[PDB]
From Swiss-Prot:
Protein name, per record: Sialidase-2
Organism whose genome encodes this protein: Homo sapiens (Human)
Family: Belongs to the glycosyl hydrolase 33 family.
Lineage, opening ranks: Eukaryota, Metazoa, Chordata, Craniata, Vertebrata
Catalytic EC class: hydrolase
PANTHER family, per database record: SIALIDASE, SIALIDASE-2
Gene behind the chain: NEU2
Amino acid sequence: SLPVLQKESVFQSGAHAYRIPALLYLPGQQSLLAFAEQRAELIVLRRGDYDAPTHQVQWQAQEVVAQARLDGHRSMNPCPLYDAQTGTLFLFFIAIPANVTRLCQVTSTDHGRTWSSPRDLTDAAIGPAYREWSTFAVGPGHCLQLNDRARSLVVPAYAYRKLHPIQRPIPSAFCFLSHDHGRTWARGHFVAQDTLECQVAEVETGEQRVVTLNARSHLRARVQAQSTNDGLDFQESQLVKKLVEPPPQGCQGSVISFPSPRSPAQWLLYTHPTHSWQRADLGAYLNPRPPAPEAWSEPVLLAKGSCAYSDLQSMGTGPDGSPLFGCLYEANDYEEIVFLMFTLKQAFPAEY
């Protein structure tokens, strides 16, 4: 139980009503948006400002994101993004009543206080391949904006491909990519088969920036792949043995990049349960030479006991002078979603 700045349940339900956390940091407002699914199935939200004087996030009352829904459909997998160029916030999500799943989004121009009517992106982003899948999803958790000239948007996703061998559809992860703030979308190529819920980050490796995709698998280790073309194509996928996956279902995990506390420009921080076969003991891992699989550190326990899905966000600089982080995760047999705020110095003291 390392020392942390804050730890509190932001969603609680004895009936396991809240699941699938998503966290988003707004750099100008210095606030967080915590999203979650509430079981029709809808997306809820709690906003909170980082109160510097007390170095605590003051969470406001829970609100339903009414706009994030299609009539007669269930809304799931909140996947938020802050567009630094326009300041607009994007909340991508899936809507479900043959493929009948829909890719949607609502936007906000007032820091997420009010949202636009839902926009169905299905046709524009998936194309003909749509009928080749049984279903699909995005995220869950925050998506990515690259530091390229266009400030491209990359949305992590996965689809159950009906390869039709009269057998169960198999999931494969991939990315949706837009260079024009969501006006147009391209669907990237799948990574290895049997990859589910993934997250993407951008880092400097060698003398170029690459997109790293870290996916859940049904194996005993995470699956990772990197792309040199913004996620359209990924090099051979590989197992990251240093990052355990509890068989046979695995578990979703979160990864983000952040400025190195020192050769490489960015480091990666990743959270996921650390137990060999159970969804327990949430740990934080560091990669100082991203995204090299062999460079991952041993994890540090953020929370002992039952823990599942999680989502991370960098939050600028913490009180002690090191990088500040926020983490939203499912805990206590899915009875709640907890918010943890800590710094790199607190979590990895050996670094300081």
